[PDB]
From Swiss-Prot:
The gene is PTPN7. This is Tyrosine-protein phosphatase non-receptor type 7. Expressed exclusively in thymus and spleen. Changing residue 2 to A: Prevents dissociation of bound MAP kinase and enhances their dephosphorylation. It catalyses: O-phospho-L-tyrosyl-[protein] + H2O = L-tyrosyl-[protein] + phosphate. It comes from Homo sapiens. Protein phosphatase that acts preferentially on tyrosine-phosphorylated MAPK1. Plays a role in the regulation of T and B-lymphocyte development and signal transduction. Belongs to the protein-tyrosine phosphatase family. Non-receptor class subfamily.
Amino acid sequence: NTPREVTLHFLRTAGHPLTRWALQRQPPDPKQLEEEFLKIPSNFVSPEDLDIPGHASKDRYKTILPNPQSRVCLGRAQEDGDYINANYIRGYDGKEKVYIATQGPMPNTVSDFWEMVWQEEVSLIVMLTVHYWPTEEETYGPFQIRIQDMKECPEYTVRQLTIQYQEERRSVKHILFSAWPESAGPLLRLVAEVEESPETAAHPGPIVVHCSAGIGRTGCFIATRIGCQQLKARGEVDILGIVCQLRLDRGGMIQTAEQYQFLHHTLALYAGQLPE
């Protein structure tokens, strides 16, 4: 069949389930992990595959585009069009819309970003390190953002934000991770922080994860989170399966073989930290 059908079939059927024991004590070697990684099709959508007039000015990178089937479509709160460079990401056991993977907002897409936050009832943003939040109080399109409180920790800064439209006020938690690797300690504390975050919206909405392109460390964070959940619930993890599912939702998730290998290391560390 067509190269598109080959790609989808691979992403749908590939898998390498590993027991907790094999991950910790007898893992695939780095050579095997690299080759396994390089077999995974990227599932990048070409510009010709999107019929969305005027999207280009809203893309940070021309070749990193949101897959049509899972893209986040904006309503009508602002500016015309429904386009943001963002995809819905399935979570643990294929549960819909657990995450939104998005690019770092540009000055012309900051209103779009907050429109997505408001529309999707997002209560948590994870940034992995244009500032799209105020030092005190800014207005972005129809939205007023205000810092309620801010605590600096050694590994991340947590901002509690208020988003206002217009007599309605919502709380959004913002975590800026300033310890991206080297070491997986901080990353797992970030995941614990994410897990410990109370829900604050009317209905549970997706967690927004971004840095710059929304595919590299964004993919690593989400793969890690899902991997931990698999290990906690099942005592095993299918990392190849996780990465394949991520690429179905957003092209190019997890950029390098080193990131792939580091995913194995991070989950091995999580496994060793599980309750006795």
